[PDB]
């Protein structure tokens, strides 16, 4: 019906500023250290 010259345009529904736009194509119209290895009792203990 609406198809024009081999083009299948059929599958279409047919029934501030106020600009006007064209329809169908819109455009303007833990762990804490332990004592060892912490450097005491490694220089100490006079007993």
């Amino acid at each position: 019906x609406x198809x024009x010259x081999g083009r299948x345009x059929x599958x279409x529904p047919x029934x501030x500023x106020t600009x006007x736009v064209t329809x169908l194509x819109x455009x303007x119209x833990r762990x804490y250290l332990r004592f060892h290895x912490x450097x005491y009792x490694x220089x100490x203990x006079x007993x």
Binding site: X2, X12, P13, X14, X15, L24, X25, X26
Partner: protein, 59 residues
């Protein structure tokens, strides 16, 4: 009014506008229509999913 995203057209005024346009502008038309269709679909799924997520958080 709108079919999916597109508004409804009238036969008489429509059959003139599409006669006006150029084959170089049909591709742009297809892509604008894809954009509007997918945008409407995403709007709908957004509504549905937000309802379901509210129910999920409540549960």
């Amino acid at each position: 009014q709108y079919y999916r995203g597109l508004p409804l057209y009238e036969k008489n005024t429509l059959l003139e506008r599409l006669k006006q346009l150029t084959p170089n502008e049909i591709k742009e038309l297809e892509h604008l229509h894809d954009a509007v269709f997918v945008n409407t679909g995403l709007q709908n799924v957004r509504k549905v999913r937000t309802k379901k997520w509210k129910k999920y958080w409540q549960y």
